[PDB]
Design a protein around this ligand. Sequence first.
Ligand SMILES: [K+]
Ligand SMILES: [K+]
Ligand SMILES: [Mg+2]
Ligand SMILES: [Mg+2]
Ligand SMILES: [Mg+2]
Ligand SMILES: [Mg+2]
Ligand SMILES: [Mg+2]
Ligand SMILES: [Mg+2]
Ligand SMILES: [Mg+2]
Ligand SMILES: [Mg+2]
Ligand SMILES: [Mg+2]
Ligand SMILES: [Mg+2]
Ligand SMILES: [Mg+2]
Ligand SMILES: [Mg+2]
Ligand SMILES: [Mg+2]
Ligand SMILES: [Mg+2]
Ligand SMILES: [Mg+2]
Ligand SMILES: [Mg+2]
Ligand SMILES: [Mg+2]
Ligand SMILES: [Mg+2]
Ligand SMILES: [Mg+2]
Ligand SMILES: [Mg+2]
Ligand SMILES: [Mg+2]
Lengths: 88, 96, 35, 64, 124, 88, 372, 117, 134
Amino acid sequence: QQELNIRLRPSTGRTFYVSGHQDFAGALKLLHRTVAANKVKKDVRLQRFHERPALKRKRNLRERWRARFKEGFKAAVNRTFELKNQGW
Amino acid sequence: EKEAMKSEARRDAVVQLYVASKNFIVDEKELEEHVNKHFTEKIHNASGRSIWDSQKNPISMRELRNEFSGFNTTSAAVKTTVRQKNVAEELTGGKL
Amino acid sequence: ELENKTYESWKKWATTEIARQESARASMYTNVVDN
Amino acid sequence: YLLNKDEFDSAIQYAEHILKPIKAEDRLTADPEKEDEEAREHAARHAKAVAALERIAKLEHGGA
Amino acid sequence: DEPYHFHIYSHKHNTHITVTKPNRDALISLSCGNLGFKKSNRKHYDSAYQLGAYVVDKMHQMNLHNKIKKMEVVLRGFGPGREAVIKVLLGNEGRMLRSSIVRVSDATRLKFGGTRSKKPRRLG
Amino acid sequence: PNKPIRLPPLKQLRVRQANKAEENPCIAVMSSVLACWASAGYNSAGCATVENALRACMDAPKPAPKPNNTINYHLSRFQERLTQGKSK
Amino acid sequence: GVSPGGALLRTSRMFSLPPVIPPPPGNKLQMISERASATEAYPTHQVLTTFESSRSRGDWGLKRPLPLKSTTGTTYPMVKVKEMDSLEQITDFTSGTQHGLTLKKFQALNIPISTPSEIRPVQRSVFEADTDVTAFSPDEQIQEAEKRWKFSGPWLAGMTPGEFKEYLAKTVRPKRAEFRKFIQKKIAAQKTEAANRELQEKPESITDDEVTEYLRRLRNDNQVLYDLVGQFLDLAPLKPPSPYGGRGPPITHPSAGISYLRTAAYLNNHPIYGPQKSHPPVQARVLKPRRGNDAKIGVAGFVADGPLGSVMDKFDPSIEGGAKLWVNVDKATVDSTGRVQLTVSDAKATDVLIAKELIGDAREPIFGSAPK
Amino acid sequence: MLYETIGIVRPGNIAEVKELVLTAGKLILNQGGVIRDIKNWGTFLLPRPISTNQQRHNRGHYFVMRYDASIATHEEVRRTMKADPRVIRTANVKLGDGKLETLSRFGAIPWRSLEEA
Amino acid sequence: VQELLQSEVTSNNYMRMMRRRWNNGDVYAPRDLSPYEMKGRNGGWVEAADVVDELGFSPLDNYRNFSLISDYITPFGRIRHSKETGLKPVNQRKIAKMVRRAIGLGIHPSVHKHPEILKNSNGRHLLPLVVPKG
RNA sequence: AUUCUGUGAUACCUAGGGGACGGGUAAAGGCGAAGGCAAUCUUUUAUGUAAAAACUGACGUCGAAGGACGAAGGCAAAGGGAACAAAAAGGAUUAGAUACCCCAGUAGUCUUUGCAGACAAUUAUGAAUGCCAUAGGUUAGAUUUUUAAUUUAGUCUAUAAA
RNA sequence: AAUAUUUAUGU
Ligand SMILES: [K+]
Ligand SMILES: [K+]
Ligand SMILES: [Mg+2]
Ligand SMILES: [Mg+2]
Ligand SMILES: [Mg+2]
Ligand SMILES: [Mg+2]
Ligand SMILES: [Mg+2]
Ligand SMILES: [Mg+2]
Ligand SMILES: [Mg+2]
Ligand SMILES: [Mg+2]
Ligand SMILES: [Mg+2]
Ligand SMILES: [Mg+2]
Ligand SMILES: [Mg+2]
Ligand SMILES: [Mg+2]
Ligand SMILES: [Mg+2]
Ligand SMILES: [Mg+2]
Ligand SMILES: [Mg+2]
Ligand SMILES: [Mg+2]
Ligand SMILES: [Mg+2]
Ligand SMILES: [Mg+2]
Ligand SMILES: [Mg+2]
Ligand SMILES: [Mg+2]
Ligand SMILES: [Mg+2]
């Protein structure tokens, strides 16, 4: 600011303050939820060792299919109960 | 007739670029007159030193979406004239 | 009359869920040592 | 921009013929102190556009 | 006025707790080994808990519980001590400093491309 | 955002564990007890209220098992109708 | 030329099922829920019925007989068919009582629909040859255009920015040549109105030397031109210089088919007491109390803001079945979005007791027992 | 071609802003270009504190210039800036799709609106 | 008088379970008040209509807007997936390149939102400062 | 364990210098003859795709050889050298351990100019043309009563006749 | 949720 400048660093974006409607214990929950949504822990694991392009590409295809299969499976499990409600 | 239609469309652009040439700067006289008017220290409501102070923040998504859902509220008359004009300019082609 | 019977069922669910949330808060806060 | 001299000048002439300050339908109420002002203003404004557009449509200011 | 900082750096094999002043100068820079934990005994969850309790206790001896009105907790790395020291700062030991906390930040270092990392290991 | 895929032909459409596993509620009360001991002491007074809660658990009888879920039966009915078909 | 089998299908009842109409238009630039969806503003599918002799068999005149578990037992048989045959070889249907019985509830209020008028509460019905008209002819003027309700052009203020650009580049731009002819027909009258009196003391409508002579004269008065551009593009009037143009024209007929009554200017003759002053009151629900500002009340399935005036102030878990208050429906009208907005006003006290008398819930009867 | 430059000069002195804007401005006009608009943004924080020319800066004086000039002028305009020791950094960008219809709707640099194209 | 607020302490609690915003004209049936409908099973507050198309802007030509670039990056400075933005694959690529352009040009941070945007949001008093240390 | 540290390390900061790398977006996604190609601005470059008209009027496909291009590693010369890492060497493990694991580490990876031409250089499937029934996704367009349906050129699952 | 000691032989 005018008197003291803002510390602009990567941790600035990963910061959560304590307010009247948010306790310290509550600021941690919002921190863990946001740190888990940005996959910080996952990247730290993938950056420990090198993964050449071919392996990284093939690893994504396997993980990308298990997410579509799981998403398409949840749709068939709920579509099954929607028909059960109708009596079919 | 198909090539004429393309020419007319090519003409409307030049007509629109003709009307918008009032604020352009073609000579050094207009440049100096423009710089000396705008690059003044006490310009941003001075007190403020930046455009942010004078015009709080640049338009965002929240402000854009609120212009069509939250309100619909009297700016409709302020906007329709901006669109009625645009519609008339397209059909008539006379740059009302 | 039908809305009354359904609204009551929602009152029960809200009452039950409200209890769970407040109880969770008590357990969430650390009262392991009482001084 | 797929333009030529003819299409360009014709657009300029057309653009100026439709923006010419319309003079009042009658002569008794119309006084020159304002009519000629629009003429000089329009003429000066027209010359500016012709000088600016000629530079924008210049093929030497284009890419490959 | 910047608050005090309670950096908690944690990785797979150790845990560091640094308490700095507003100008980011270390006042209490300790590790699990400073408590006597030897080569491999400094990675356990309980080892990091005692370190946090030791640091918090050492802060009282320096009269910092009445001198720090605003404090910040910075978490680095996802080691065992990340959750251990928190429960220390969120339990009976940190009852005094809990009210002075105003911020909670994460400072885990990531690289956008960066230098090449070690080749993967073949443990089997 | 794409919609869920149509599952390929599977040998059998079913969920691995139909019935939700209910975490023993008293492993959570034990975790709290282990917390008091570390923060305070093994033989102190602030642990009386929490230790009793742990003793109240193991004295209470185990709840009865919940009725089996019939999800896998309905999934087997709508398998060929929901997915591309059956294999094998 | 049509085959005999095809002539029966054309007149078949199943073929008469109208296409699913688009849902009530909501704000495009706003979030929405993904999975769970509640009842819509107005119905989009057709409600079906059967004979009680066939319902016991699940026969609904559809591809296959419906299940008896989910279609038998209730009083009013109503079903909506989303797909007569889906990819699961089943008729994806659902109960239709959500909208089927809401129509009966509203029609039980015996209140017509009125034309919205900004805030002498003069109410004018919708079903009137003065306003309820869709056909027109070139002799129509802008004064008569304010009476119509079905314009073929869009509402500028309502269209989003992107939609407005497509409209200009797909409907307004290619209509340049045709618009010039429109003026030629008008200028054919500009010449002949100089002969307004030539006979008391039209030309062939092709003059490129004239259409240019006119529009250049209208650049100083933009208002007269807009009125001329609206006639050719069938745009609902926007500026006052009347028919509630603030929120836009209705995407549906003003009644919307809910109720075809024209006036509530009648006095329901009570059996004993005689002609009553007001209409019978209706018990309404209380949703979203004041103390998310404002109050809502459920009036015959529809959601309308509470009366101008307590149960409404705060939520009370003590009341059984929720807070319910009696009220009278004053005026009802359809919104430009297709919703049914009810201007609800709190009811009197004596009328509520007069209503409870017939129902029997009136603790103190007004007849006989009442000494004063 | 329609270009756009965002110069970030040192703060504190307004003279260094005028002389730089005029140096690049007069340069574009002499070559045969057409300056469309010059918005004078003030001094606000940079994306991060950077060091340039033996100085550590925290906030620069922004200014946007939208002009239509040749490639030789564009390269000469942003080469003079980068060479000038008073600019913290510059951000040149080509505007539009290269088509006349989209190029006819670029006016003043907007702040409370979008460049609807 | 605390007995009053004690009653309101529960009023807001119950109102928090009314996971639905009633509007004028919205038809409701006796089933719309049950827990199944009030529970709000919808697990996604998705965006609809592809705002980019609806608003008719070219993102690539709006790389100056610091608020528009901060609206399509997480607080950590990571571009948002098409699930959150709810855009078509074409518009997503156009906005993704718009964020990479501004960051690459050096006119917007890459790990947080623009500093001038962090001032007006909450935490302005507690924003991390830089002590001169000298 | 070798190793770093009282010549003050790790940890937390401030101020400078130096190299290569490319987080999210990201998808069954796209682009080129293939090899292969993923931060960014400007400059520059040949095909390909959709719709409408217009134009040339068989001008087409395949193609020995020659020539050109051709991954990583490698040779040669001049630069660069943070990080990683063949080799060489040391510490462990082990009956032994060149090895798998660890402390470190040179060529080399990077820039420029040449040589070299070998790959699971793969779709284990040469290129191209005509033709054969459907379904569910998906990519870039077009048309429409643009809500949703038709449609052109790709790609991917599951089938019919075969 | 990213754990990892050692296991040779069998006309
Ligand atoms: K230490
Ligand atoms: K010929
Ligand atoms: Mg190694
Ligand atoms: Mg082994
Ligand atoms: Mg030192
Ligand atoms: Mg560098
Ligand atoms: Mg390949
Ligand atoms: Mg990437
Ligand atoms: Mg291709
Ligand atoms: Mg060939
Ligand atoms: Mg050959
Ligand atoms: Mg090579
Ligand atoms: Mg080499
Ligand atoms: Mg060498
Ligand atoms: Mg060796
Ligand atoms: Mg060895
Ligand atoms: Mg090494
Ligand atoms: Mg060669
Ligand atoms: Mg070949
Ligand atoms: Mg296909
Ligand atoms: Mg592909
Ligand atoms: Mg196949
Ligand atoms: Mg053998």
